[PDB]
């Protein structure tokens, strides 16, 4: 029955703070002028950093843990990945999807992630994975608020009954409408697919998250239609453009023109560093492009951008432990957001910016909000990122739902010495 | 009460000529076999060059003289320019627009310009600048025939009530319908905006002048729609594509295909050398492209192309004295039209070709035409351009409306010597 979080550091704030908890919510936040004593019912942050929970804005829980089944993606490309997934999709069973999704979700809970948006392939007349995921959503609710995107992986207009299946998925309860314009057979189908996606989102009052321009094609500009339709409907807050890796290859003049619309539209952007560095640049010899969208410029322009893990051991990515600080680490390097302040503020890319992408209404350390927060054994964002620290405690509804007793490293010199990699 | 212009040289003609004037018109033109004596009622061209008036086919009189108000365009780009202008547009007043427009118009009269096409931003519900410019048009009529383009600077489909405001501007009397497809939110809005522009021009029997592809984007090809719609409606003579700077970046194969249509369509092209060299190439590091449309190739293909000043001390250009020979000088250098004949024929780019762009019906030194002409103290186009000569006399309706007493330079060597920079 926790009543207070004491000795907490907060990003962008000086000193220590006390967070009072009442009835599963944050009742008040007060600055401390020194270190407070521990006591029963008090969770001691020990001058560590307290932040709202990590968020996973983009993952594929229906494909997670399937890498190599029945075959491996040899080329390491998005296109072969979809082909390898199609082979696995034909072998799906309800229980298998639930088991694999739950395996990755447990890693996420352990990693302080309390909000997850999973795409689920609905280019499947049986909607096997979707039915399984809707059950997982209910089962995992005490620990993670899971959003499900009805993702038409093989296209809306380019797959048999694609539009009907996408709508069926919404009627079954999917929270977000997906699309993949660059995978449609033609540019015209791509644009038309977006009009259909927006019409469905307005008909059912759902969010939108488009796999948008995930291709090293300087002519893949579906993002301008996503932003324009959102602006026209006055619904930018409910819309997300995932990937936009083609933007890495656009000329600068078009990008500058486009940025005005991106800002005016208010839509969100998701970059997936671990997967993008792996799948993009595969058609270059040397030099080889990085292939991540224009994260640095978006931040400078005040456009909301955040980071997702995208895949965890599946056709598009052979690694991962569903760790957001690891995703952030890769993104900061590839996007060259390596200034001290840029690294320190990096936490926003896996917390607040992602919460905005998911249109969350109860997020942040503020009075009145649910007591959902995590404690990192680090002094600030820079320190947490540099040392790739685990989540010491994850609190949800005012209760501890995960904890990590840190590793203990000792070197035996003339005398034993504890090493914590700090300075 | 001038009755004759004597000792006149004419471009492309040998010898001297006499131009007889009667009732404000040119009654006859006769060759001379020698130098004629001066006499009362005779304006002596003194073997200088006589040409129809200079023309300014593209200028923004509503923004002229506002550079730095309230802020400067730091990046030197078209996009920031529009943003800086938006800030100034919110501060417009009727009298301020009239005063600034008249300041630049007086410089134009002094520079022998008797025909001017000004764009006026109509992405403004108050249409403040347009109302002011319609009054200026009437006031300046004795000296300059001013055409007003209803220019939807912030887009037709991408600005609130953009189409209604564009039509309102035509109902108030604007002479030309404008558009800016590359600034619309999407390629589809760009193309649609052109269909709407042409429909308005046919509904009101007005000319068209599109700010077309003014961007270093090799995919900005709105010019093909402008030309195709003009060809379909059989109205090329009434249509102009301004800038087309993207053409500088097109691959050669597409450009060759496009050129057939450009020629067949009969539309006009305006290049704005002083502004284009400044605003284009801003997204390149090194090498840096010039960014002017394909003027040399247009001339070789018989496509009508001409030069405008575009801006005089405003968001898009911090310099200028509204001097067409200076605009021509820049264009010849950047477009590499540096052969003797190319330079000598350069005057066509600021006289006859521009008159065609404005669809002028009374222009040129020919019997029956109004006696509107200017006298340059130079032997030919090459000489006028090299020495950047002023306009000795500007005649309109058979009367002198401007004159420049040339500067007198002397060097004091062993004896004083007059220097005129001639050879
Ligand atoms: O279309 C896609 N499917 C799965 C992925 F992991 C990648 O995000 N893109
Ligand atoms: O769109 C534009 N507005 C103003 C200029 F000077 C430039 O011609 N382009
Ligand atoms: Fe994905
Ligand atoms: Fe212009």
From Swiss-Prot, chains A, B:
GO molecular function: cytosine deaminase activity; ferrous iron binding; identical protein binding; isoguanine deaminase activity; zinc ion binding
Subunit structure: Homohexamer.
Name the UniProt record assigns to this protein: Cytosine deaminase
Function according to Swiss-Prot or TrEMBL: Catalyzes the hydrolytic deamination of cytosine to uracil. Is involved in the pyrimidine salvage pathway, which allows the cell to utilize cytosine for pyrimidine nucleotide synthesis. Is also able to catalyze deamination of isoguanine, a mutagenic oxidation product of adenine in DNA, and of isocytosine. To a lesser extent, also catalyzes the conversion of 5-fluorocytosine (5FC) to 5-fluorouracil (5FU); this activity allows the formation of a cytotoxic chemotherapeutic agent from a non-cytotoxic precursor.
Outcome reported for the amino acid change (mutating residue 243 to A/N): Less than 0.01% of wild-type enzymatic activity
Any one biological process term the GO annotation gives: cytosine catabolic process
EC class of the enzyme, as a word: hydrolase
Mutation effect (residue 9 to W): In strain: SO5076
Chain residues that bind Zn(2+): 58, 60, 211, 310
Assigned GO CC terms: cytosol
């Amino acid at each position: 029955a926790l009543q207070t979080i004491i000795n907490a550091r907060l990003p962008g704030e000086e000193g220590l703070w006390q967070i009072h908890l009442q009835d599963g919510k944050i009742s008040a936040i007060d600055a401390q002028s020194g270190v407070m004593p521990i006591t029963e019912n008090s969770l001691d942050a020990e001058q560590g950093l307290v932040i709202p929970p990590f968020v996973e804005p983009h993952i594929h829980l229906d494909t997670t843990q399937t890498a190599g089944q029945p075959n491996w993606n040899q080329s390491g490309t998005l296109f072969e990945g979809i082909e390898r997934w199609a082979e696995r999709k034909a072998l799906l069973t309800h229980d298998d999807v639930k088991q694999r999704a739950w395996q990755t979700l447990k890693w996420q809970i352990a990693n302080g992630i309390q909000h997850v948006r999973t795409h689920v392939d609905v280019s499947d007349a049986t909607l096997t994975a979707l039915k399984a995921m809707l059950e997982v959503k209910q089962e995992v609710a005490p620990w993670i608020d899971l959003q499900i995107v009805a993702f038409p992986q093989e296209g809306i207009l380019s797959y048999p009954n694609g539009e009907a299946l996408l709508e069926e998925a919404l009627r079954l309860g999917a929270d977000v409408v997906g699309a993949i314009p660059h995978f449609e057979f033609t540019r015209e189908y791509g644009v038309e697919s977006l009009h259909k996606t927006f019409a469905l989102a307005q008909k059912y009052d759902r969010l939108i998250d488009v796999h948008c321009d995930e291709i090293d094609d300087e002519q893949s500009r579906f993002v301008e239609t996503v932003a324009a339709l959102a602006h026209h409907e006055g619904m930018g807050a409910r819309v997300t453009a995932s990937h936009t890796t083609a933007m890495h290859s656009y000329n600068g003049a078009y990008t500058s023109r486009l940025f005005r619309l991106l800002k005016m539209s208010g839509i969100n952007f998701v970059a997936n560093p671990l997967v993008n560095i792996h799948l993009q640049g595969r058609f270059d010899t040397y030099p080889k492009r990085r292939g991540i969208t224009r994260v640095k410029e978006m931040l400078e322009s005040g456009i909301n951008v955040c980071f997702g893990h995208d895949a965890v051991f599946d056709p598009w990515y052979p690694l991962g432990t569903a760790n957001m600080l690891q995703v952030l680490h890769m993104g900061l390097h590839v996007c060259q957001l390596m200034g001290y302040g840029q690294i320190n503020d990096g936490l926003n890319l896996i917390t607040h910016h992602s919460a905005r992408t998911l249109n969350l209404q109860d997020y942040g350390i503020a009075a009145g909000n649910s007591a959902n927060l995590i404690i990192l054994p680090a002094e600030n964002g820079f320190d947490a990122l540099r040392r790739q620290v685990p989540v010491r405690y994850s609190v949800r509804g005012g209760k501890v739902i995960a904890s990590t007793q840190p590793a203990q490293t000792t070197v035996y010199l003339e005398q034993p010495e504890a090493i914590d990699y700090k300075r």
